[PDB]
Amino acid sequence: GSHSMRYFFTSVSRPGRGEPRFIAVGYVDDTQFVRFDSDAASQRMEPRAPWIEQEGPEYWDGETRKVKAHSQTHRVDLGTLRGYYNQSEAGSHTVQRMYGCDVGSDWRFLRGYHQYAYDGKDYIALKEDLRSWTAADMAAQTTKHKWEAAHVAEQLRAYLEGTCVEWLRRYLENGKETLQRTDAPKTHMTHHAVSDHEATLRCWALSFYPAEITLTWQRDGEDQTQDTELVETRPAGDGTFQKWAAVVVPSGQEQRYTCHVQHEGLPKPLTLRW
């Protein structure tokens, strides 16, 4: 299938003393590969995947230089937003930024995005045309006006359509053994008797990558969504992911029910029964 590169940035003001906490992370698909923390001792962009260590000092200095420019933009943004919204200097506030590009299975440009939030609310986002903006309110309209005058959008379009996808291809090549390998779910099933009448069945999917997964229950070959639970997909810690789903069933009727697992790393979707 497709792939993506995405950076995520968070800036948090500290009003009593000093500058804001700033954290950046880089992802290729579901794999963190770089990071910056203002509170860390290095004050450098740092690798978090083996295949990015391949890169020389010049890369690391460039990335450190850009990440600190991002840091400063956000520092400035917090002040600008404080005055736009008439807030006092007593409060801690948050700024968040996410941008990135997607490519399809042919590794050619598909989409790009860039969105920005203030205290966890939409502020301004780049439209899919990569030529116009969506401001959520009148503060963000002023920004929209500034950025139209300054042709920010065109700068971003150059990056997203050009450089972003070039470096994504590079990363996918240099991280071939992991980034282009899918791991299939390791699946099993547990039972839990709550009373003599009521049994709970749980379908587990473990140790799979990428994160995208679908777990559905059937009864006598038909989709059941009643009396079922499905947890948020959660990370294992070792690069892979986990997810379970449960259904409550009458005790003695367990054989009627089936869990159905769809994942990119499975040629045919799986079926389990107790």
Binding site: G26, K66, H70, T73, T80, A150, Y159
Partner: peptide
């Protein structure tokens, strides 16, 4: 590879 520019609001 980060964007080379981060234009402020």
């Amino acid at each position: 590879y980060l964007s080379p520019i981060a234009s402020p609001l």
